Design an enzyme around this catalytic site. Structure first.
Site, PDB file in Angstrom:
ATOM      1  CE  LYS A  41      -3.747   2.135   2.716  1.00  0.00           C
ATOM      2  NZ  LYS A  41      -4.519   1.995   4.015  1.00  0.00           N
ATOM      3  CB  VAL A  43       0.360   6.809   1.026  1.00  0.00           C
ATOM      4  CG1 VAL A  43       1.350   7.334  -0.010  1.00  0.00           C
ATOM      5  CG2 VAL A  43      -1.022   6.863   0.424  1.00  0.00           C
ATOM      6  CB  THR A  45      -2.664   8.613   7.767  1.00  0.00           C
ATOM      7  OG1 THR A  45      -2.195   9.221   6.624  1.00  0.00           O
ATOM      8  CG2 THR A  45      -2.557   9.610   8.986  1.00  0.00           C
ATOM      9  CE  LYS A  66      -6.423  15.239  -0.432  1.00  0.00           C
ATOM     10  NZ  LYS A  66      -5.359  14.236   0.126  1.00  0.00           N
ATOM     11  NE  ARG A  85       3.862  10.847   2.639  1.00  0.00           N
ATOM     12  CZ  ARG A  85       2.679  10.448   2.073  1.00  0.00           C
ATOM     13  NH1 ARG A  85       2.648  10.375   0.735  1.00  0.00           N
ATOM     14  NH2 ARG A  85       1.550  10.295   2.810  1.00  0.00           N
ATOM     15  CG  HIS A 119     -12.244   7.346   2.734  1.00  0.00           C
ATOM     16  ND1 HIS A 119     -11.251   6.710   2.020  1.00  0.00           N
ATOM     17  CD2 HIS A 119     -12.254   8.680   2.394  1.00  0.00           C
ATOM     18  CE1 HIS A 119     -10.713   7.649   1.264  1.00  0.00           C
ATOM     19  NE2 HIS A 119     -11.285   8.867   1.478  1.00  0.00           N
ATOM     20  CG  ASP A 121     -10.904  12.541   1.691  1.00  0.00           C
ATOM     21  OD1 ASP A 121     -10.880  11.614   0.818  1.00  0.00           O
ATOM     22  OD2 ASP A 121     -11.042  13.733   1.440  1.00  0.00           O
TER      23      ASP A 121
END
Length: 124
Positions: A41, A43, A45, A66, A85, A119, A121
């Protein structure tokens, strides 16, 4: 199968730590949370707060996501988060990540009843 709500908890919540503690945090967590099972994956958070405080975002500032959806919400307060990342050396299945610590507002999309985050975002 896993609910959208449970997937969000697995992918994004880490109430067990206040912050990432070493450069290997992302490598360890992406692995342990099963995010590198099918592919790296790119990226991700992680949020270092109680689940209750992240759920409460669904009753905070309504904003467009977004992609233009209107079921996004932004946290009134900043939160402790870890950004992961992929590194130029990452090569499936030895996915490698740069760990970056930050404190920012989070934007989540919410759905259902109870109305909860499904989700992540963005962070602003």
């Amino acid at each position: 199968k896993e609910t959208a709500a449970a997937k969000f908890e697995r992918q994004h919540m880490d109430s067990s730590t206040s912050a990432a503690s070493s450069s290997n945090y992302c490598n360890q967590m992406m692995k342990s949370r099963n995010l590198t099972k099918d592919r790296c994956k790119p990226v991700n958070t992680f949020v270092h707060e109680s689940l209750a405080d992240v759920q409460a975002v669904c009753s905070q500032k309504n904003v467009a996501c977004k992609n233009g959806q209107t079921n996004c919400y932004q946290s009134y307060s900043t939160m402790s988060i870890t950004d992961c990342r992929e590194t130029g050396s990452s090569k499936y299945p030895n996915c490698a990540y740069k760990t970056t610590q930050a404190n920012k507002h989070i934007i989540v999309a919410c759905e259902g009843n109870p109305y909860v985050p499904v989700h992540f975002d963005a962070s602003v």
